Every structure is written in structure tokens, then in C-alpha cells.
């Protein structure tokens, strides 16, 4: 492991560490909810 | 070391092993010796 590090360097092994996992995903399929709140904000704040 | 191997593969660490060492070098600076043996071989074997 010392020899492998000697060739590749310090940053390469540390940055190659895994990140992605299947449980942290977030899905936004709602327009219906966000469109309603979007309109009432326009309606109340109307100036121009 | 298992994670590092997982990324890079099996062949990469094995082929990257060191080879060169300063003590195995071989120097041929002699023409004077090799030219003499070269001529006598011609002289004896002359046909054409």
C-alpha cells in the first residue's frame, strides 16, 4: 500500500473514495403543489 | 488497499512494480578488443 501510494500520489486515493449511495436520492415530480404557491405569491405581491 | 485495487484493477499494481537498479548496468566501450577478433574471423573464413 506504501508502494501503490508512492506511484499514484496522496490526492488520488483520497479523492477516489466512494460517494454515491442509492438511498440519498431526491425526486421532485410535483408541479401541482409548486404552481399553486407560485400563483398566490404573484397575486399578493402584484405591483408592476 | 482493497478499495484502491477495486478502482485500478489487478494488472496495474503488479506491472507498476519497480525494476531498475543502479547496480545491474553494463557498459561496452571496447571497440579495440572486438575489432581484432572481428578481423581474424574474416581472414580465416574468407571465401567470396
Q: What is the 3-state secondary structure (H, E, C) of A6-42?
A: HHHCCHHHHHCCCCCCCCCCCCCCCCHHHHHHHHHHH
Instruction: Tell if the CB–CB gap between A4 and B7 is shorter than 8 Å.
Output: no
Method used to solve the structure: cryo-EM
Residues in chain A: 48
Mutate to test the interface with A, among B2, B7, B9, B10 (most CBs of A within 10 A): B7
A15 touches chain B (CB under 8 A): no
Phi-psi region of B9 (alpha: psi -120 to 50; beta: other; left: phi over 0): left
Half-sphere exposure of B17 (CA within 13 A, CB side): 4
Q: Are B21 and A30 in contact (CB under 8 A)?
A: no
Choose among A26, A21, A10, A8: nearest CA to B16: A8
Max CA separation in chain B (angstroms): 68
Choose among A3, A25, A27, A24: nearest CA to A13: A3
Amino acid at each position: 500500500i506504501d508502494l501503490v501510494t508512492a506511484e499514484l500520489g496522496s490526492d488520488w486515493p483520497r479523492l477516489v473514495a466512494p460517494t454515491f449511495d442509492a438511498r440519498k436520492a431526491v425526486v421532485f415530480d410535483d408541479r401541482w403543489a409548486s404552481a399553486r404557491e407560485d400563483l398566490v405569491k404573484l397575486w399578493l405581491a402584484e405591483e408592476g
